């Protein structure tokens, strides 16, 4: 159904892998389409214009030449509507950047190691989720500069957490990582709702230590799980086994909100099969309305599936691993970022 044309490409002069890309979905209709890229010690902003034009806006260069940004995520200031960009990577430092000036507003130290992904709560712009090499997830309230909770410990992940996602209403998180597991952490529990409210009321702040998840499975994939997203009440997750698996906790007819923490079953609903994406750390993405699913492979091919029912986007110059993709909010534009620092723009026909 969906068709795209490659209208432009460029290469960042640092020539290092680009691991993250995100359009700013908070921009109002009528405002310019903006996306950020992250790789090496760099954070770069670009604006999309007519006739495939990619306009460089500003570049953030970390004073630490050894920093390697892995992820970025957009939010806004709850009081002034001002756009904000969070970035993190190998150093395990979260930096809140002002995207209009490209200067860092503040930074958070805490994670014992590298941060693999950042996500903002879909309803509360102040709630930032970080997943780390230290086997834990952390929830921060960036308005009061407090660590709300740490998800890890006794029954937490046993190796690096690679990805996590909030569901559409921000009531729960699914995380995944190097231990091959996918774990559910409910944040609409009376305990978590109160811990969030308390973070707004803030002796130093006492963070919740959540050692036990609400569901756990190691029965979906047989290797590192590097990307997870909610698709309604269902889950989309992938490993390096050349498939995105669509699955759900419990038996076929089990309600996600009735799943007990000891639930032993999983139900597979289907698989999105592809090829040459058998290396670790390759993200898939969806558009805002979750009508499209995109994933790049290790040789520069871009797969796009229609979620309401597969298109393969290739260019002879795009041969490097596509680490992540991002759709514009209206889904008219798809950007792919690569291991060789190249950026590819695909416009919907």
């Amino acid at each position: 159904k969906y068709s795209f044309k490659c209208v432009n490409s460029l290469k960042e002069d640092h020539n290092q892998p680009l691991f993250g890309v995100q359009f700013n979905w908070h921009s109002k209709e009528g405002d310019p389409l903006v996306f950020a890229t992250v790789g090496s010690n760099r954070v770069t902003l670009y604006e999309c214009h007519s006739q495939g034009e990619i306009r460089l806006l500003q570049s953030y260069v970390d004073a630490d030449a050894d920093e390697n940004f892995y992820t970025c995520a957009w939010t806004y200031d709850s009081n002034t509507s001002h756009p904000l960009l969070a970035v993190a990577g190998s150093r395990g430092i979260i930096r809140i950047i002002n995207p209009i000036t490209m200067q860092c507003i503040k930074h958070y130290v805490g994670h014992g190691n590298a941060i693999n992904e950042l996500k903002f709560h879909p309803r509360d712009p102040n709630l930032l989720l970080s997943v780390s090499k230290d086997h834990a997830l952390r929830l921060w309230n960036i308005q009061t500069d407090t660590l709300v909770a740490i998800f890890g410990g006794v029954e937490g992940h046993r190796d690096e957490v690679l990805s996590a996602d909030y569901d559409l209403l921000g009531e729960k998180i699914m995380s995944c990582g190097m231990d091959h597991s996918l774990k559910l952490w409910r944040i609409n529990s009376k305990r978590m709702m109160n811990a969030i409210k308390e973070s707004y009321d803030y002796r130093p702040f006492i963070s919740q230590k959540i050692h036990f998840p609400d569901f756990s499975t190691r029965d979906i994939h047989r290797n590192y799980v590097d990307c997870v997203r909610w698709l309604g009440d269902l889950i989309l997750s992938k490993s390096c086994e050349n498939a995105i698996v669509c699955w759900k906790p419990g038996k076929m007819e089990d309600d996600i909100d009735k799943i007990k923490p000891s639930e032993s079953n999983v139900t597979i609903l289907g698989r999105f099969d592809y090829s040459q994406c058998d290396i670790w750390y390759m993200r898939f993405s969806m558009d805002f309305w979750q009508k499209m699913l995109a994933l790049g492979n290790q040789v520069g091919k871009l797969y796009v599936w229609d979620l309401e029912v597969c298109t393969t986007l290739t260019h002879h110059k795009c041969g490097a691993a596509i680490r992540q993709t991002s759709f514009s909010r209206d889904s008219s534009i798809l950007i792919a970022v690569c291991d060789d620092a190249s950026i590819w723009r695909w416009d919907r026909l």
């Binding site: 700013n24 979905w25 908070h26 921009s27 109002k28 405002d31 310019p32 903006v34 902003l45 604006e47 806006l57 806004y76 002034t80 509507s81 001002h82 756009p83 995207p99 209009i100 879909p122 309803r123 559409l168 209403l169 698709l231 309604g232 009440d233 269902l234 805002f288 309305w289 979750q290 309401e308």
Partner: peptide
């Protein structure tokens, strides 16, 4: 599918919250 109906209604709620917002351009 019933899950698609859940997606539609929940994304519509988020889009309405986005439509009520006027975030400053980058």
């Amino acid at each position: 599918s019933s899950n698609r109906q859940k997606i539609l209604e929940r994304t519509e709620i988020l889009n309405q919250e986005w439509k009520q917002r006027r975030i400053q351009p980058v």
